[PDB]
């Protein structure tokens, strides 16, 4: 019969990358975590104590509880027709900070700086991002790039 273990169908998910086996580098044990930090879950098979389940691999969550050698995170999980808040206790070696937030934080810093610049200088600025607008009118010149005429390519002797 079928099996549903804790680490079933997890052959490629919990294995180290090629030429990356061995001990964990010491940056992971020096990155600090506060309550409210958004972290990615990315387990390694080397540390078996405190592993996440195979569902939570790749999910991003929020640290709610920091204790010795492990942080607890909160992950919304869809079961049935609604999301549940799953609180789970991970060691630090299965946790990386999310750089998806550290563009938004520096963007807040940058636009607060230029907003304080503009509102005391006497100009008006926009602070919202914009999608890729359509291109504008340009005059493509013909000095070295004289238009070379192309033709479709036949088939015989190409085969």
């Amino acid at each position: 019969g079928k099996s549903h273990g804790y680490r079933s169908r997890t052959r490629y998910m919990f294995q180290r990358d090629f030429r990356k086996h061995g001990a964990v580098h010491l940056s992971t044990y020096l990155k600090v975590y506060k309550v409210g930090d958004i972290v990615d879950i990315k387990a390694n098979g080397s540390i078996q104590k405190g592993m996440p389940h195979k569902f939570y691999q790749g999910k991003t969550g929020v640290v709610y509880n920091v204790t010795k050698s492990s942080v607890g995170v909160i992950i919304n999980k869809m079961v049935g027709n609604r999301y549940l808040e799953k609180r789970l206790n991970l060691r630090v070696e299965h946790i990386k900070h999310s750089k998806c937030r550290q563009e938004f934080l520096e963007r807040v810093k940058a636009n607060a700086a230029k907003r304080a610049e503009a509102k005391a200088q006497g100009v008006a600025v926009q602070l919202k991002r914009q999608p890729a607008q359509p291109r504008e009118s340009r005059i493509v010149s013909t000095e070295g790039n004289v238009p070379q005429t192309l033709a479709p390519v036949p088939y015989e002797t190409f085969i």
């Binding site: 709610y64 607890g72 919304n76 869809m78 027709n81 999301y83 808040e85």
Partner: protein
């Protein structure tokens, strides 16, 4: 024998709802050594700002 037809339509009829976050999440799963002290810090802050 486990046909998952119509289950996603049934799930999306009444919506798939977020868990509705609040200010001040519960301190029931946090470190008890921190929570025992946070009780006293909140009590001291309240007693300080009461007579101000």
């Amino acid at each position: 024998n486990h046909t998952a037809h119509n289950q996603t339509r049934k799930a999306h009829r009444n919506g798939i709802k977020k868990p509705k976050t609040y200010k001040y999440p519960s301190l029931k799963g946090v470190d008890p050594k921190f929570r025992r002290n946070h009780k006293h810090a909140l009590h001291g802050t309240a007693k300080a700002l009461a007579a101000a």
